[PDB]
Design a protein around this motif. Structure first.
Motif, PDB file in Angstrom:
ATOM      1  N   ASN A  59     106.158 -44.451 -33.496  1.00 19.94           N
ATOM      2  CA  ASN A  59     107.252 -43.782 -34.220  1.00 19.94           C
ATOM      3  C   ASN A  59     108.576 -44.456 -33.790  1.00 19.94           C
ATOM      4  OD1 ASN A  59     109.423 -41.531 -34.011  1.00 19.94           O
ATOM      5  ND2 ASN A  59     108.135 -41.048 -35.754  1.00 19.94           N
ATOM      6  N   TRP A 119     111.455 -43.486 -33.115  1.00 21.21           N
ATOM      7  CA  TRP A 119     112.319 -42.817 -32.117  1.00 21.21           C
ATOM      8  C   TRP A 119     111.775 -42.996 -30.706  1.00 21.21           C
ATOM      9  CZ3 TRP A 119     115.980 -38.443 -33.178  1.00 21.21           C
ATOM     10  CH2 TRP A 119     116.499 -38.532 -34.465  1.00 21.21           C
ATOM     11  N   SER A 166     104.891 -41.821 -38.894  1.00 20.73           N
ATOM     12  CA  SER A 166     106.216 -41.419 -39.458  1.00 20.73           C
ATOM     13  C   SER A 166     106.620 -40.008 -39.054  1.00 20.73           C
ATOM     14  CB  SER A 166     106.216 -41.593 -40.958  1.00 20.73           C
ATOM     15  OG  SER A 166     105.230 -40.804 -41.555  1.00 20.73           O
ATOM     16  N   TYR A 202     105.553 -37.803 -36.575  1.00 17.80           N
ATOM     17  CA  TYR A 202     105.340 -37.264 -35.230  1.00 17.80           C
ATOM     18  C   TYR A 202     105.630 -38.363 -34.220  1.00 17.80           C
ATOM     19  CZ  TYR A 202     102.390 -34.366 -38.320  1.00 17.80           C
ATOM     20  OH  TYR A 202     101.903 -33.633 -39.377  1.00 17.80           O
ATOM     21  N   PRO A 203     105.979 -38.009 -32.972  1.00 12.85           N
ATOM     22  CA  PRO A 203     106.310 -38.998 -31.929  1.00 12.85           C
ATOM     23  C   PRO A 203     105.052 -39.575 -31.241  1.00 12.85           C
ATOM     24  CG  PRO A 203     107.303 -36.809 -31.475  1.00 12.85           C
ATOM     25  CD  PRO A 203     106.266 -36.642 -32.529  1.00 12.85           C
ATOM     26  N   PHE A 237     107.775 -33.256 -29.621  1.00 13.51           N
ATOM     27  CA  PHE A 237     109.161 -32.966 -30.053  1.00 13.51           C
ATOM     28  C   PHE A 237     109.990 -32.583 -28.817  1.00 13.51           C
ATOM     29  CE2 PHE A 237     107.715 -33.427 -34.249  1.00 13.51           C
ATOM     30  CZ  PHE A 237     106.908 -32.420 -34.730  1.00 13.51           C
ATOM     31  N   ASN A 238     111.317 -32.692 -28.884  1.00  8.40           N
ATOM     32  CA  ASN A 238     112.175 -32.194 -27.792  1.00  8.40           C
ATOM     33  C   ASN A 238     113.265 -31.339 -28.445  1.00  8.40           C
ATOM     34  OD1 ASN A 238     113.163 -31.751 -25.189  1.00  8.40           O
ATOM     35  ND2 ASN A 238     114.462 -33.561 -25.286  1.00  8.40           N
TER      36      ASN A 238
HETATM   37  C1  LIG Z   1     114.247 -33.367 -31.347  1.00 11.25           C
HETATM   38  C2  LIG Z   1     112.935 -33.621 -32.018  1.00 11.25           C
HETATM   39  O1  LIG Z   1     111.904 -33.622 -31.351  1.00 11.25           O
HETATM   40  N1  LIG Z   1     112.916 -33.842 -33.353  1.00 11.25           N
HETATM   41  C3  LIG Z   1     114.137 -33.870 -34.165  1.00 11.25           C
HETATM   42  C4  LIG Z   1     114.301 -35.243 -34.777  1.00 11.25           C
HETATM   43  C5  LIG Z   1     113.090 -35.569 -35.640  1.00 11.25           C
HETATM   44  C6  LIG Z   1     111.737 -35.414 -34.904  1.00 11.25           C
HETATM   45  C7  LIG Z   1     111.528 -36.540 -33.882  1.00 11.25           C
HETATM   46  C8  LIG Z   1     110.074 -36.936 -33.603  1.00 11.25           C
HETATM   47  C9  LIG Z   1     109.563 -38.018 -34.509  1.00 11.25           C
HETATM   48  C10 LIG Z   1     109.220 -37.540 -35.896  1.00 11.25           C
HETATM   49  C11 LIG Z   1     110.335 -36.802 -36.620  1.00 11.25           C
HETATM   50  C12 LIG Z   1     110.670 -35.443 -36.016  1.00 11.25           C
HETATM   51  C13 LIG Z   1     111.705 -34.063 -34.160  1.00 11.25           C
END
Ligand SMILES: CC(=O)N1CCCC2(CCCCCC2)C1
Length: 185
Positions: A18, A20, A47, A49-50, A170-171
């Protein structure tokens, strides 16, 4: 258990991550960044999920590795088919090509469909993952609790090469920034 002797050196595959995620220089640690990490899109990246895959592909044999989950609130770990869906929404289930466990909202569950409650007395700081390709087995061990069994998926129908699978979670809470780390052999 006595699976330690099948230890394998897992590294993370940047190209599957992902956008991010931040993967360390040694490709042994991953954490969720506070923004897009300035990489191009590609058809491999998860896309929604992390998530990220290990680089290694397994089609035979017995394999073992360990992951550090210290101070995380949420994560998914296990193996998946090399051909799992990357884009859009999906469930972690064997029908979709995933053999996983997770932590979510103070409970541990196995990624069956529907999901199975795990009974963990000692919250793990490190998880051991054992795959026997020929036997069709994926097992999870609590390294913090002297290696106690967490969960065994048996009669697995892998139906392809397997890759190590990770979700840092997620955070939204500000309490789940800590990385997943592949532990030394
Ligand atoms: C803070 C957090 O965890 N978020 C907010 C930003 C988007 C998300 C990031 C994870 C990658 C997939 C898209 C969801 C979820």
């Amino acid at each position: 258990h006595h699976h330690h002797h099948h230890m394998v050196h897992i590294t993370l595959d940047r190209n599957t991550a992902n956008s991010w995620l931040i993967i360390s220089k040694d490709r042994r640690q991953v954490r969720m960044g506070d923004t897009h990490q300035n990489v191009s899109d590609n058809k491999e990246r998860f896309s929604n999920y992390p998530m990220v895959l290990g680089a290694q592909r397994f089609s035979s044999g017995k394999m073992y590795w360990e992951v550090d989950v210290t101070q995380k609130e949420a994560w998914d770990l296990g193996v998946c088919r090399d051909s799992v869906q990357r884009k859009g929404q999906f469930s972690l289930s064997p029908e979709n090509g995933f053999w996983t466990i997770w932590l979510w909202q103070d409970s541990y569950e196995a990624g069956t469909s529907p999901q199975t409650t795990l009974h963990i007395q000692v919250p793990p700081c490190q998880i051991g993952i054992f795959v026997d390709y020929e036997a069709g087995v994926v097992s999870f061990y609590n390294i913090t609790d002297h290696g106690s069994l967490i969960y065994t998926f048996s009669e697995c129908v892998f139906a392809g090469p397997l890759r190590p699978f990770f979700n840092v979670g997620f955070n939204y809470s500000g309490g789940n920034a800590a990385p997943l780390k592949l532990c030394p052999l």
